Write a protein that binds this ligand. Structure first.
Ligand SMILES: C[C@H](c1ccccc1)n1cc(-c2ncnc(N)c2C#N)cn1
Length: 294
């Protein structure tokens, strides 16, 4: 008999994720079916999105050789039936207060910072770059969390040193770039560009650095279709472009310029679920039909 979710203490909520205390040394990391676009959590959930993204994360943890916070199998008996397939039992860590971001391509706030200053997070870049320019080598572009409705603020390496220590900052930088490089190469081999990615790390009792969040999901990372990669224009979101196009199209009745957006057409939600499955199966070489669920 699996426990009820109500047996555990809710300790944190994100836009589309939840965190629960299981015991003194373990948490339950829960992905929901909610989806965010234009910094709004949309009214309409995407069926199986939580399960698909959990499957993705589990695959990438297995691909990487670095210590991670997984503390049991996807069907661990401590996982409630209600969240089976979209929840992971993890080890409690002392989390480091740094959003560890790697960018292989220049877009979003990285692009904006570059267009404003010529630099991103302390990195002075060549002149002449633009939207979706390839960065080589990938950049460590750390950020810190701000207030509830605010975007993370980009910071430089010295800021990271000030947050975690000089040696630890080096370690975060090196591991972030190494992990991103490995996963990006794997994905691209399968036809998907991982343009960038965001990690959080924590520290265990012995002082070891442990990867601890979700890793390389389309929420934590920009997924692009490599077959349509065209530098100089904004790349379609592999998973969210249908959602984006409808919301800003002639059928939504919504002006993006910060009214809460309307619910999505069922057809758009279903199409979106399909894109998540496509991305998962291509990258993992596995079938989502095999992934556990209620
Ligand atoms: C910000 C992020 C979060 C995730 C899910 C929902 C809301 C927030 N978070 C992660 C921890 C955390 N703390 C201790 N040990 C861990 N292994 C983890 C993890 N993962 C605390 N917060």
């Amino acid at each position: 008999m699996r426990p009820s979710l109500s047996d555990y203490q809710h300790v944190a909520s994100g836009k589309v994720r939840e965190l629960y205390r299981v015991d003194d040394e373990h948490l339950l990391f829960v992905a929901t079916d909610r989806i965010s676009a234009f910094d709004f959590v949309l009214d309409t959930p995407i069926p199986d999105k939580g399960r698909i993204l959990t499957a993705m994360s589990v695959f990438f943890f297995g691909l990487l050789t670095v210590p991670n916070h997984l503390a049991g199998p996807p069907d661990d008996p401590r996982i409630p039936e209600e969240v089976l397939g979209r929840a992971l039992l993890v080890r409690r860590l002392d989390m480091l207060p740094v959003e560890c971001v790697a960018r292989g391509y220049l877009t979003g706030s990285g692009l904006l910072d570059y267009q404003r200053t010529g630099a991103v997070c302390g990195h002075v870049l060549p002149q002449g770059l633009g939207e979706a320019s390839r960065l080589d080598p990938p950049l460590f572009t750390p950020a810190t969390k701000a207030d509830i409705g605010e975007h993370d603020m980009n910071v430089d390496f010295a800021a990271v040193v000030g947050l975690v220590g000089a040696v630890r900052a080096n370690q975060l930088r090196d591991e972030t770039i190494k992990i991103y490089t490995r996963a990006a190469a794997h994905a691209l081999h399968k036809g998907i560009i991982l343009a960038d990615t965001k990690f959080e790390f924590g520290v265990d009792i012995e002082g070891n650095l442990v990867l601890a969040d979700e890793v390389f999901t389309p929420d934590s990372s920009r997924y692009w279709d490599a077959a349509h990669y065209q530098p100089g224009v904004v790349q379609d979101s592999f998973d969210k472009q249908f959602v984006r196009n409808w919301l800003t199209g002639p059928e939504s009745g919504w002006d993006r310029a910060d009214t809460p957006p309307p619910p999505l057409p069922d057809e758009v939600a279903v199409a979106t679920r399909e894109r998540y499955i496509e991305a998962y199966e291509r990258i993992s070489g596995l079938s989502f039909s095999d992934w556990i669920g209620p």
